Amino acid sequence: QLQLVESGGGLVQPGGSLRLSCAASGFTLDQYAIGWFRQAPGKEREGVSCISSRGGATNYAHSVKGRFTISRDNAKNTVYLQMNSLKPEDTAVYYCAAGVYTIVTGTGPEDGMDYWGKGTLVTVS
Amino acid sequence: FTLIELMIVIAIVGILAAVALPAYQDYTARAQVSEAILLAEGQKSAVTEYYLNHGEWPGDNSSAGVATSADIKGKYVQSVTVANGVITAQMASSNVNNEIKSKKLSLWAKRQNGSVKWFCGQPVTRTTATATDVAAANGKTDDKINTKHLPSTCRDDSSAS
Ligand SMILES: *[C@@H]1O[C@H](C)[C@@H](NC(=O)[C@H](O)CO)[C@H](O)[C@H]1NC(C)=O
Ligand SMILES: *OP(=O)(O)OC[C@H](O)CO
C-alpha cells in the first residue's frame, strides 16, 4: 500500500537552515494534499504547513509564518519543506501526511488525513 | 429683570455650549463596515460554482477563481481572503475609524437538503474542505469586529445552523 518516507533530519545550529522531503515509492501523489505535523517532547501534536494537490494553495501556522516555505513537484512524487531562521523552540519530531486539504489553525487538524509517516527527529542546539 | 437673571442666563448658555454627545463613532463604523460587507458579497458566485461542480470548497483564491487578497481593496478595506469556502475581509490600518482599525469579519455558507444558507458575522474558520461545521477563528488574536459595529442582521454565531 501507500507508504510515506521522510528524510533530511539532523542537527542545525541556531540561525541556520534545513530542508525536508516527504516522498512515496511506487505510488503517485497527485490527488492528495500533503501536510506537515510537529510533535514536541511532552506536548501534543500540532500542524505546521499544508499544500494543495495542484500546488496553488498554501497555509502555515502562526509561529512559523514568514520563516518556512513549502513546495511541491509533480514530475517526481516528492514534497519539499524549507526551514529558515531556526530557533531552539522548534526542536520536535516532524511528520508528513496525505489526505484532504486542511487549515493548520483549526480544531482537529488530523481529522482530514488517512495516511501517515514514521517521522524524523530534528534537534536545534 | 436684574443682574442675577443675566448671570443665570450666561451660565445656562455655557452649560448648553459645553454639552456632551452620543456615540456617533459606532454609526460611522457601521457605515464603513457596510463597504466591506458589499465587497465580500461579490465572491459568493465563484465559491458556490466551485463547490457545486467539484464537491468541495475552494482552499484559496487561486482555485476559487478570484484575484489575490491584496488586490481586492477599497477605500476602507485592505484585503479579502478565501479559505475553505470562508470569505474574510480586513479593514485598513490608517485613515479609518479608530474602533474598526485592522479588524476582520467573515461570511460562510452551510449546505442543506434543498437550499444553501449564507451567514454573516464574526470571523470563523473551516478545517477541512469537506467539513460541514465551523468554529471560532482564533484564540490567540484580537482581530474581531465588535458587535456594536455590525448591523443587526450580520450578527451570527459559529453554532448557527
Ligand atoms: C483549488 O482548491 C481545492 C480545494 C484544492 N484541492 C485540493 O487541495 C485537493 O485536491 C482536495 O482533495 C485544489 O488543489 C485547488 N486547485 C489549485 C490550487 O490549483
Ligand atoms: O493572503 P491575502 O491575499 O489574504 O493577503 C495578505 C496580506 O498581505 C496581509 O494579510
Numbering used by the authors:
A (entry chain C): 3 to 127
B (entry chain A): 1 to 161
Reproduce the article's own wording on this structure.
Type IV pili not only serve as multifunctional organelles allowing the adherence to host cells and the auto-aggregation of these bacteria, but also play an essential role in their pathogeneses. Molecular dynamics of the whole pilus with GATDH and G3P for a period of 1µs showed the overall stability of the structure. As previously described, the PilE monomer contains a 4 strand beta-sheet region, and an N-terminal melted alpha helix that forms the core of the type-IV pilus.
In accordance with the results obtained above, the F10 nanobody binds alongside the pilin face with the interaction surface spanning the PTM containing alpha-beta loop and the hypervariable region. In the case of F10, the nanobody complementarity-determining region 1 (CDR1) does not seem to contribute significantly to the nanobody binding, it remains free, away from the pilus structure. CDR2 loop residues [S54-G58] contact PilE_S62 and GATDH on PilE_S63, with many close contacts and a few hydrogen bonds established. The GATDH moiety is buried in a cleft between PilE and the nanobody. Concerning the CDR3 loop, residues [V102-G114] contact part of the hypervariable loop of PilE, R126-A129, plus N138 further down on the same loop. The shape complementarity between the surfaces is highly precise, exhibiting a buried surface area of 659.7 Å2. In agreement with the binding assays mentioned above, the F10 interaction surface on the pilin is away from the phosphoglycerol moiety on the pilin. The structure of the F10-pilus complex explains the high specificity of this nanobody for the SB sequence type over the SA sequence type because its binding site is located on the side of the pilin surface containing the hypervariable loop.
